Amino acid sequence: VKPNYALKFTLAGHTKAVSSVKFSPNGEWLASSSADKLIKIWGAYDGKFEKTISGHKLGISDVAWSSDSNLLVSASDDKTLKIWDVSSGKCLKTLKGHSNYVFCCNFNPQSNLIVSGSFDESVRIWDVKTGKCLKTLPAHSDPVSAVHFNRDGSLIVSSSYDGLCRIWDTASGQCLKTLIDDDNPPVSFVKFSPNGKYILAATLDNTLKLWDYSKGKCLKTYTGHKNEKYCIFANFSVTGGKWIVSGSEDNLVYIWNLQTKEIVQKLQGHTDVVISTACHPTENIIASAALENDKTIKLWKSDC
Amino acid sequence: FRPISVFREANEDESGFTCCAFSARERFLMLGTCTGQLKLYNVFSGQEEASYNCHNSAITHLEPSRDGSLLLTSATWSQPLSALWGMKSVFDMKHSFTEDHYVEFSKHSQDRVIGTKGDIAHIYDIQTGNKLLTLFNPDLANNYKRNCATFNPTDDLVLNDGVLWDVRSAQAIHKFDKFNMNISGVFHPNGLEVIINTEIWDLRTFHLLHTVPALDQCRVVFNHTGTVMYGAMLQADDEDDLMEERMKSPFGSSFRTFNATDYKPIATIDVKRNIFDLCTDTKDCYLAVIENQGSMDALNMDTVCRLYEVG
């Protein structure tokens, strides 16, 4: 069984590279962040522009939804994150503390904490309602590319140009695991699997790996794409067939069979690096976004 | 300037030469690359002779020691941002300067290194790698955006962020007023004047000796007799964001030569391609220039090295 994603809409509107696209958890919206300093909201089914959210002073690297779909957090090159009320478009809090660019952000499931990762090589944990920094983790010896909470919020996973993935205890901030294989090329992306049992990690040697982080074991390797420079987001597709999804520096979206590790589709259409992809939470819908020479977001739909 | 040789980076789909210097074994040129490699080339054949992994980001600038035993490299964002390499028999790192985005050898006896971190100058010993001195005064700083600290020809003085320092006393002796946003200035090889953007100041008196409008936003290098100055203008737009900065080559597409004693113009050379670096050999017979042939400048970077005969 292979999917048959086909292009349904192309979303134009950002005036610089698009850095991240995220489906709201209720399935209704797509949020996009951009080097143009803007967040835009789109209809997740019709692709129709909804609104622009503004306030950062420089490019935006990442954006993330709260569990109830009412808030966003953004991470900016201006060294802050911002918490936004989606309905009003207003900035509720500015999180200040990182000493250089913020690349990655996420709420926890409970949505009372935010986790952030930065060029300054730290991971920070923030109080959503006070806007204050609760903990600063000396997480890595090189820039942090991704941070993600697990499904019950008790763990954070981080990935870094230092070649390491690390797991952290949310409450204590203690490091609980350091994952490394036969080598340590920059780790450009990581997230937990939806069941919390695995870690999916990208390295800048054109390679994705599925880890059992408890056992410290690499279980699946996914290759065939091009990833040596950019921090490309990746996903578990779980609404139909069980896929791994990732962008690529040959401007394609790649889809693999999670179990067999074979490529099952490549989506053609973007004209620049596909740095971000997202899988809709209830339907077989994929959003992809590309860098400065493309500037568009594409929405694809599959029958399985 | 008669073209003598041209070559592009071997192996690579997109040629990534970023900076160059002649090595002590003439006929061979050292080039940094956008992947943090140091490479050795025969400048006449275009044959790659060696490749060494120096940094985890693009090499921005480099300088060999006059005696060919040492090399300084600076990278783009990865630490260490600068390093010192031994070139005797085996090539390897002697010391590293993790936060200095720019480094130069001392000039008379090349026994020290001066690094720059923002507004701050660091002086290091070549043997121990120890930091011997930090030169910074926040009340005198000009906060030049492309500040580069540099020794004078006898190494007794330092120019940093438009402030003249006496090394032995670690004391600031004069602050030159700020008349541009980026360029902090160099010593003239004669040791008696300084070139700070368009202003030429006399070190005897601190009087203004010359206004040279053509030197605005320029980096400069001298032939080894100290009789001719080369200058090329940085490509700028301060209103450029981070992405827009990467779209650009370091320099525009022309360089100028000037008489080193009175700054009168000699030649204006437009190679019709944006410039990444240029250097001369110790005898000033040859000029090497890293030229971008990319159609959209450093967006799709594709550089060649051109060797010109200095007439």
State the method.
X-ray
Cα separation, A273 vs B21, whole angstroms: 34
Beta strands in A35-154 (DSSP E): 39-43, 49-53, 60-65, 71-76, 80-85, 91-96, 102-107, 113-118, 123-127, 133-137, 144-149
- Are A24 and A42 in contact by the 8 Å Cβ rule? The answer is no
Q: How far apart are CA B59 and CA B73, in angstroms?
A: 7
Query: What tokens does B77 get?
Result: 């964002």
Q: A237-240 contacts: CB < 8 A, separation 24 or more?
A: A237/A279, A237/A284, A237/A286, A238/A194, A238/A279, A239/A279, A239/A280, A239/A281, A239/A282, A239/A283, A239/A284, A240/A3, A240/A284, A240/A302, A240/A303, A240/A304
Among B36, B305, B93, residue whose Cα is nearest residue A228: B36
Eight-class DSSP state of A230: S
Distance CA B146, CA B135 (A): 17
Resolution attained, angstroms: 2.1
H or E stretch at B151: strand B150-151
Q: What does the alpha-carbon distance between residue B174 and residue B192 come to, in Å, rounded to a whole number?
A: 14
Q: How far apart are CA B114 and CA A60, in angstroms?
A: 36
Burial B25-44 (b: 16+ CB within 10 A, else e): eeebbbbbbbbbbbbbbebe
A17 in contact with chain B, both atoms CB, cutoff 8 A? yes
Contacts of B288 (CB under 8 A, 6+ apart): B20, B22, B29, B43, B278, B279, B280, B305, B306, B307, B308
- The answer to whether the CB of A208 falls within 8 A of the CB of A222 is yes
Contact state of B242 with A16 under an 8 Å Cβ cutoff: no
Cα separation, B131 vs A45, in Å, equals 60
Contact with chain B for residue A134, Cβ under 8 A:
no
Q: How far apart are the first and last CA of chain B?
A: 6
On whether the A1-304 domain is CATH 1.20.58.220, my answer is no
- Between CA B265 and CA B218 the distance in angstroms is 14
Q: Do A17 and B241 touch (CB under 8 A)?
A: no
Contact A234, A256 (CB under 8 A): no
A226 interfaces chain B, CB cutoff of 8 Å? no
Return the amino acid letter for B49.
E
DSSP-assigned letter for residue A247: -
Q: Any CB–CB contact under 8 A between A197 and chain B? A: no
* Neighboring chain A residues of B56 at a CB cutoff of 8 Å: 161
Asked if the Cβ–Cβ distance from A58 to B243 is below 8 Å, we say no
**By the CB < 8 Å criterion, does A152 face chain B?**
no
Contacts of A77 in chain B (CB under 8 A): 242
Taking CB atoms and an 8 Å cutoff, what residues of chain A touch B53? Answer: none
Does any CB of chain B come closer than 8 Å to the CB of residue A16? Answer: yes
What is the least distance, in Å, from the CA of A19 to any CA of chain B? 12
Distance from the first to the final alpha carbon of chain A: 9
Q: B243 and A77 in contact by Cβ < 8 A?
A: no
- Overall fold of domain B13-220+289-303: Methylamine Dehydrogenase; Chain H (2.130.10)
Report the 10 Å Cβ neighbour count for A43: 15
Closest CA to A39 of A81, A5, A2: A81
Helix (H) or strand (E) holding B246: helix B242-246
Give the C-alpha distances (Å, rounded to integers) separating B56 from A50, A262, B214: 41, 31, 36
Mutate to test the interface with A, among B243, B247, B301 (most CBs of A within 10 A): B243
How far, CA to CA in Å, does A43 sit from each of A13, A25, A55, A144, A280?
14, 13, 22, 31, 12
Q: Which of B240, B143, B138, B228 is nearest to B184 (CA)?
A: B143
Which of A54, A20, A21, A25 has its CA nearest to residue A37? A54
Query: Residues B214, B265: contact at Cβ < 8 Å?
Result: yes
User: What is the maximal distance between C-alpha atoms in chain B?
Assistant: 54
Quick check: A155 contacting B, CB < 8 Å?
Answer: no
Chain A residues closer than 8 Å to B241 by CB: 35, 58-59
Specify which residues A208 forms β-bridges with.
A202, A222
**Nearest residue of B to residue A36, measured between CA atoms:** B241
Nearest to B84 by CA among B66, B105, B109: B105
Sign of the Cα torsion B89, B95, B101, B106 reads negative
Write out the two tokens for B171: 């004391």
> For residues A41 and B304, what is the distance between their CA atoms, to the nearest angstrom?
44
* Interatomic CA distance for residues A261 and A252, integer angstroms: 17
A35 and chain B in contact, CB less than 8 A: yes
Up-side HSE of residue B144: CA atoms within 13 Å toward CB? 28
CA distance A301 to chain B (A): 32
* Residue A208 Cα, gap to closest chain B Cα (Å): 21
Select the residue from A102, A120, A292, A294 to test the B interface by mutation, using most B Cβ atoms within 10 A.
A292
Alpha helices, DSSP H, located in chain A: none
Q: Are A5 and A302 in contact (CB under 8 A)?
A: yes
β-strands B275-280, A102-107 pairing: unpaired
Residue B255 CA: distances (Å) to CA of A10, A89, B251, B266, B271: 45, 50, 9, 11, 9
CB contact under 8 A, B243 and A292: yes
C-alpha gyration radius of chain B: 18
In angstroms, the separation between the Cα of residue A224 and the nearest Cα of chain B is 19
Q: Please state, in angstroms and rounded to a whole number, the distance separating the CA atoms of residues B213 and B202.
A: 17
Q: Which pairs with CB-CB distance under 8 Å and at least 24 residues apart come from B122-127?
A: B122/B97, B122/B149, B123/B158, B123/B167, B124/B95, B124/B97, B126/B70, B126/B84, B126/B94, B126/B95
Spatial distance between the Cα atoms of A134 and A131, rounded to a whole number of angstroms: 9
Domain extent listing, chain A: 1-304
Answer yes or no: are the C-beta atoms of A114 and A128 closer than 8 Å. yes
Q: For residues B276 and A177, give the distance between their C-alpha atoms in angstroms, rounded to a whole number.
A: 44
Write the DSSP symbol of residue B244: H
Q: Which amino acid is at A299?
A: L
Which residues have CB under 8 Å from A167's CB, separation 6+?
A155, A156, A157, A175, A176, A177, A178, A179, A199, A213
Q: Compute how many other C-beta atoms are within 10 angstroms of the C-beta atom of residue B69.
A: 15
Whether residue A3 contacts residue A304, with contact meaning beta carbons closer than 8 Å, is answered with: yes
Q: Which residue of B has its CA nearest to A293?
A: B299
DSSP A10-51: EE---SS-EEEEEE-TTSSEEEEEETTS-EEEEETTT--EEE
